Nucleic acid binder design. Structure first.
Ligand SMILES: [Mg+2]
Ligand SMILES: [Mg+2]
Ligand SMILES: [Mg+2]
Ligand SMILES: [Mg+2]
Ligand SMILES: [Mg+2]
Ligand SMILES: [Mg+2]
Ligand SMILES: [Mg+2]
Ligand SMILES: [Mg+2]
Ligand SMILES: [Mg+2]
Ligand SMILES: [Mg+2]
Ligand SMILES: [Mg+2]
Ligand SMILES: [Mg+2]
Ligand SMILES: [Mg+2]
Ligand SMILES: [Mg+2]
Ligand SMILES: [Mg+2]
Ligand SMILES: [Mg+2]
Lengths: 48, 82, 145, 141, 143, 63, 206
RNA sequence: GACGGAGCCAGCGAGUCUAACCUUGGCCGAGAGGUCUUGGUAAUCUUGUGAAACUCCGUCGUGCUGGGGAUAGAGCAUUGUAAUUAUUGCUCUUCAACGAGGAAUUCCUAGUAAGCGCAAGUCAUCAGCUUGCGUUGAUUACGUCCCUGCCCUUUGUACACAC
RNA sequence: UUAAUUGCGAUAACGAACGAGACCUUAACCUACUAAAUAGUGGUGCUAGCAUUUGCUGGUUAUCCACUUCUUAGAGGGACUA
């Protein structure tokens, strides 16, 4: 909101930032990512 | 025997016990100009004792210099009469 | 509501019974400084001498002080009822005294001497420096000296 | 006969009975006028219903209170409760109901415990402590 | 309108009545006065000492005017207090009995109270009149 | 030494190691339509009012 | 106004203080407009009380004490440190004398004086331990108005207490000193000094 | 705030037979207590258990001081066959440390904490303890899982007297 | 979701048991029942004092009369988050 109000060039875009993240297993488990699953749900290959 | 303390002494004021003419007329000329008068005032100002302060307060209220508004024991509250 | 100014014969520390008694404090608790004289005894003798207790000790007369001293030195002569006394039915003569400044220490000491030379339990206890009134010594009087 | 009611005010362990009849406006407490309840400040605490509703409503009636139990503060709270409840009882039995409604509304708008007793009661004492909830002291070493 | 002991503050009544008794100067004082503590639990004797027997007697008179019957036991219970037992915790100790006993005996001899059935002491007619008149004047001092 | 009044409109949740801190979404009274998020120490309600000694700051939201 | 008579004489003192207007001990609860916003609805005025002794129950729910009269909260805070626990009559007497003194000095309404003191010695920003475990710091946060009021009362009473301790001045006049200096803004009062200390610390730990 | 006077309010409970309990009242005693009687086998009598903190008037006046009251001397009483290493109570005198407590650590969310005393238990006597009772009556959360632990689920384990 | 394997429910499980809860005691309400000199209150007799103009404060066991708000209980009601 502040940026749009203080911006010249209305309508503009506010573009995005893109980076592909590679984590190791240890870091991903520590960072509240792929945490841990039951023996049966380990086989679940889909996302939420 | 370790105490675990500091034990810093004080200055030990020597408030007066009995008065003379100099303290008396100082009282009589200085209990006015005081908007609030009580034992604490007559000890943090003029260095008389608290007993002398009680007696002097009763005396001055006898004459009429200080006006009372509540004379509850352990806290006497007087103002100056104008 | 009494304000008398004063006349400058007031005296600070005075002397009686070989005790530097303080002025500038009321006579009862001033006289309490005298070993052998407590609040009750001093209040009573200052009542019997008919000196005002509202007066500070430094503001008093030599005749009043001498009257008070005479009373405390022979109190039973002035209708003191013989149970205010610290040494009554003494141990030797059977009369009733009231010890004072240095006589208190001397009398305590000769009592301890009597018990020690008698080899009584309390005397042996006093000599060893322990408790004598039957207290427990297991947890108290550790750094007693 | 005379128009007469009798009510009670309560606190922890104090109860104040209050006879309220028709009279000339004397308000006594155990033998004595209302100005000698003897904390000297809860005196103003007990004047409250009179001061609220106006002393004109006490001119035609006699109130006499007998208090027992508790301590000084609880006795005062019981006295004021009994006075208010006896006034309301008189205005309900002999005066009409509109005055009772106005009086009750004033009393409860100032303070709820004027007419209704405080339901707070002592919690009992349980072992292992000096009190209900407190325990003595734990020693580990 | 009439008045009674119950229409005036107790402090005012007791002060007035003790002043009346001290000025009248006929009741009594035993002789062990100016020596005693009034209680085995008190630590020092009274501070006034120019009286206080009249204060005690006025308090007893008000007490018996209020009540029906009392005794030296009740009065010791009433005038006793917390004895500071040094390093041990405090405890109720009842007052001295000779004091109140002789107070009641003097009140009898001056005629303010009498001995009563069911044991104890009771307020008499002339004593009731005396206390009522002293209360009337105690109230209208404020004119 | 200026300060800013801010009215609470939404309590989000508790925060802090020990639960003595609360997140709130305040809307500024003056300069209205501005809605910042803040940490709060004590008992707080909506429609309460806070005095921000510093207004140009947002707390890390937990959600 | 007219004075009413009864079989038991009721003083004209209580009659005036009763029916013309409902006062405090002998003071009024009108003309006590609060200086600072954000403490309205949390300091209780406009519900007058004859005395600061109300056997009320404000501890049962959370924000009920905000409806308790502020003078009763002051009295309640005045009685602590053991020997003083209980003894609310002494706190009421101390408050009566304190308001008398705050009338003879500083002739403003003493209720206005105390509410000004509360508004002025209320810490607005304070610190608190925030962290994820071993990485934990004292971060600065806002302060709620109820906590502002409570901390103000605590600071005032504690300063008055440890001032009146071991000296000849009384708890009442020490509290009067504290309240007046806090309503003015002094840096001599325990309360204002602690307030500025906390605010400076929170500024440094932003 | 200590002291001295006045004011002056509770509740839970116990109590004598082949016995000697709770004791009013009167008298004596500074006091403790003694003595002559009395009531009660108890909602009736002790006991309104006239408790204490509390309030009001005064004394004191920031002084290890009239704060505090251990440590000691002497005497008077009571319980008990017997108190001597004091059973306890009382009187006078002596009047020590202690100037709010370091590293640490306990209990507690409303009539609760805390302060205040009372009854009963043990008991011939001996409360600073306990079990309950009531009197005065705050502050501060009404939340979190950071420490200390508990519960359920998933997960890993070379553990099974089981971290 | 609950203080609660307490419930909603989902469901290779169905139907049960124990515990929890329900239960018992106690504290709080009943100017509605039963009553009661071993608890009270009011009035009337006798009586003390002050006022006196009716009144105010009290005492009074064999003065009785009446009642049960306070007190005691027994049977019941009441809250079940309405
Ligand atoms: Mg407790
Ligand atoms: Mg007393
Ligand atoms: Mg104590
Ligand atoms: Mg001080
Ligand atoms: Mg002492
Ligand atoms: Mg006292
Ligand atoms: Mg009772
Ligand atoms: Mg722990
Ligand atoms: Mg015992
Ligand atoms: Mg033994
Ligand atoms: Mg034991
Ligand atoms: Mg909780
Ligand atoms: Mg592994
Ligand atoms: Mg194995
Ligand atoms: Mg290992
Ligand atoms: Mg009659």
């Amino acid at each position: 909101r502040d940026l749009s109000e203080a911006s010249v060039y209305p309508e503009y875009a506010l573009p995005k930032t893109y980076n592909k993240l590679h984590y190791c297993v240890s870091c991903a488990i520590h960072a509240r990512i792929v945490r841990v699953r039951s023996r049966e749900d380990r086989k679940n290959r889909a996302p939420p | 025997k370790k105490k675990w303390s500091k034990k810093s002494m004080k200055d030990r004021a020597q408030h007066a016990v009995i008065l003379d003419q100099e303290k008396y007329d100082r009282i009589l000329k200085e209990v006015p100009t005081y908007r609030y008068v009580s034992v604490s005032v007559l000890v943090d100002r003029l260095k008389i004792g608290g007993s002398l302060a009680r007696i002097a307060l009763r005396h001055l209220e006898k004459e009429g210099i200080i006006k009372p508004i509540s004379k509850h024991s352990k806290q006497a509250i007087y103002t100056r009469a104008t | 509501s009494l304000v008398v100014q004063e006349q400058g014969s007031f005296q600070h520390i005075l002397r009686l019974l070989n005790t530097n008694v303080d002025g500038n404090i009321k006579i009862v608790y001033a006289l309490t400084t005298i070993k052998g004289v407590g609040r009750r005894y001093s209040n009573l003798v200052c009542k019997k001498a008919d000196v005002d207790l509202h007066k500070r000790a430094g503001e008093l007369t030599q005749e009043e002080l001498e009257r008070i001293v005479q009373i405390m030195q022979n109190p039973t002569h002035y209708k003191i009822p013989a149970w205010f006394l610290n040494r009554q039915n003494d141990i030797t003569d059977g009369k009733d005294y009231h010890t004072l400044a240095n006589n208190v220490e001397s009398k305590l000491r000769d009592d301890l001497e009597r018990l020690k030379k008698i080899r009584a339990h309390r005397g042996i206890r006093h000599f060893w420096g322990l408790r004598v009134r039957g207290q427990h010594t297991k947890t108290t009087g550790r750094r007693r000296a | 006969a005379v128009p007469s009611v009798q009510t009670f005010g309560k606190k922890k362990s104090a109860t104040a009975v209050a006879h309220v009849k028709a009279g000339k406006g004397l308000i006594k407490v155990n033998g004595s006028p209302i100005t000698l309840v003897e904390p000297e400040i809860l005196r103003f605490k007990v004047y409250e219903p009179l001061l609220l509703v106006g002393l004109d409503k006490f001119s035609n009636i006699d109130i006499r209170v007998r208090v027992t139990g508790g301590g000084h503060v609880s006795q005062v709270y019981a006295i004021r409760q009994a006075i208010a409840k006896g006034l309301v009882a008189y205005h309900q039995k002999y005066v009409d109901e509109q005055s009772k409604n106005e009086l009750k509304k004033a009393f409860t708008s100032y303070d709820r415990t004027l007419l209704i007793a405080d339901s707070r009661r002592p919690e009992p004492k349980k072992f292992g402590g000096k009190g209900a909830r407190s325990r003595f002291q734990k020693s580990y070493r | 309108p009439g008045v009674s002991v119950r229409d005036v503050a107790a402090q005012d009544f007791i002060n007035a009545y003790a002043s009346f008794l001290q000025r009248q100067g006929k009741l009594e004082v035993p002789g062990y006065v100016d020596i005693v503590k009034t209680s085995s639990g008190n630590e020092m004797p009274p501070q006034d000492a120019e009286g206080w027997f009249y204060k005690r007697a006025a308090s007893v008179a008000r007490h018996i005017y209020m009540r029906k019957q009392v005794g030296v036991g009740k009065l010791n219970k009433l005038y006793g207090g917390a004895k500071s037992r040094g390093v041990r915790p405090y405890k109720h100790i009842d007052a001295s009995g000779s004091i109140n006993r002789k107070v009641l005996q003097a009140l009898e001899k001056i005629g303010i109270v009498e001995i009563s059935p069911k044991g104890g002491r009771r307020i008499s007619e002339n004593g009731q009149r005396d206390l009522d008149r002293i209360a009337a004047q105690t109230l209208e001092e404020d004119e | 030494t200026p300060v800013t009044l801010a009215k609470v409109i939404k309590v989000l949740g508790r925060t802090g190691s020990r639960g003595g801190v609360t997140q709130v979404r305040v809307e500024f009274l003056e300069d209205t339509s501005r809605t910042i998020v803040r940490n709060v120490k004590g008992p707080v309600r909506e429609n309460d009012i806070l005095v921000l000694m510093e207004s140009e700051r947002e707390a890390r939201r937990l959600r | 106004f007219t004075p009413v008579v009864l079989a038991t004489p009721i003083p004209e003192e209580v009659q005036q203080a009763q029916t013309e207007i409902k006062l405090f001990n002998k003071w009024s609860f009108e003309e006590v407009e609060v200086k600072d916003a954000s403490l309205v609805d949390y300091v209780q005025v406009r519900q007058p009380i004859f005395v600061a002794h109300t056997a009320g129950r404000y501890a049962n729910k959370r924000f009920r004490k905000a409806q308790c009269p502020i003078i009763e909260r002051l009295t309640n805070s005045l009685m602590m440190n053991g020997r003083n626990n209980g003894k609310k009559l002494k706190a009421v007497r101390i408050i009566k004398h304190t308001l008398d003194i705050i009338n003879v000095l500083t002739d403003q309404n003493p209720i206005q004086v105390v509410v000004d003191a509360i508004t002025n010695t209320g810490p607005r920003e304070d610190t608190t331990r925030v962290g994820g475990g071993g990485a934990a710091r004292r971060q600065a946060v806002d302060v709620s108005p109820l906590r502002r009021v409570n901390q103000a009362i605590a600071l005032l009473t504690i300063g008055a207490r440890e001032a009146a301790f071991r000296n000849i001045k009384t708890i009442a006049e020490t509290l009067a000193e504290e309240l007046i200096n806090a309503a003015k803004g002094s840096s001599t009062s325990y309360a204002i000094k602690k307030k500025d200390e906390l605010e400076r610390v929170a500024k440094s730990n932003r």
